[PDB]
Amino acid sequence: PRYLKGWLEDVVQLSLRRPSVRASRQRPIISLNERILEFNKRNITAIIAEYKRKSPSGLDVERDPIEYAKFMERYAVGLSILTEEKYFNGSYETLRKIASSVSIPILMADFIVKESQIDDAYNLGADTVALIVKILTERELESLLEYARSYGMEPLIEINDENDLDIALRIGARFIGITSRDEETLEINKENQRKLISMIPSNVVKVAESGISERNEIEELRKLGVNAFLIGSSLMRNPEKIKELIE
Template sequence: MKGVLEKLANNSQTAIKDGVYDIRYANTKSQKNLVDVIKNNKHASLITEVKFSSPSLGNIREISDPVQIARQMVDGGASALSVLTQPYLFNGSPEYFTKVRKGVTIPLLMKDIVVDKIQIDAAQKLGADVVLLIQAIFDNKFAKDIDEFVSYAHKKNLLVLLESHTRQEFADSTKTSADILGINNRNLDTLEIDLATTQSILKDRNEKRIIVSESGIESPKDIQFLKKCGADAFLVGSSIMKSRDIKGLVSELVLAI
């Protein structure tokens, strides 16, 4: 895993040096708390992702108006949106995030490879409600004290989604004060996806916090399987971004439960 993670971490350092996160304005965040939204949703809680490229798939969708895409997702019933701000390998940008923030009112997750607090500062200024942290980034020493990062995000009035992939990473994530715990079904070393990752990690679940299953979700059956495994919400990106009917697919997945 370290080779891929190192590349992703280095990309973030490059983006920091390039001034990508030098945000000089302040957007207004959502009035909705994502944890409450998920707890009160009787259907599947989807965090749908606006991303045009990824390390595993390359170009996913021709770059177009992110707001139009976001509104289709909202119309389909998404509980929140994840918007990529990482420019390298993901074709994301803070500019896309700002456009989406001004175009929708539901909670937004700033999706990036966070290795420095300047990215958390950027998330606050962009109007994010939630920021992503990745357990393996800290375990592999590409960023320092995870507790310090979580605390810093909280001081900026941001919720933290802390993502893990292995049972050990998940166990470590439960020791933090992160608000939401994520399980990435994708192995960052091989880029292979296995939904059984969520099943394995949650086999003996005794965690009370919201748990989000991420990656590899394509159908209502996937949602139903992961729900039975113990997932409370679902982050879905590539399959929706590849779809010719974004609103229809989101609605289909939301109504799987």
């Protein structure tokens, strides 16, 4: 991985030593990016609802994961499950139990730095994974993208700046998340997020991530070409909000 500082350096070293799991997957992969495009053709707002108990930006809640997932199943285009343990209080069991309980596509969100974490996502039932450009070298990113595709996944390649975007397009990403949060500093910049969105080709499936709480922002981003919206904190604190956000 890259040489980082602060909490990201810590989470990367933790991830390198993450013990892998063993299990026989039950259901074939179902595509999150393809379901997003189907929602777009149906003119249904496509929200990826995220389950996370804690975050470095101060979220700290307890909520039953299965009850949350079963509620979201009616409304969300997919789910994102945090599996990072130290900063997000996620776990592999959380992913396994949620995947075993819903039929919509599931994204495992963690700090993937080694192939066995993709093995873990597959064996636990996830349909895809996030790969974060700013924690990986270009060579690692290309290799992990190919590895995930060899299972039948289309990973969400996450970008925050123009250097990240250059890499993501160069390596052939087809499913890009544009996060407004710089994970190193926790700073939110929506202007920069909109700039990057405008630089992505129309045939790439685009997901806006971080800081979304209001239907007005979803509408404005949809007008700019965003295909789907990854929303965590606001839904973890008031799950029923997704109903208003999709209206």
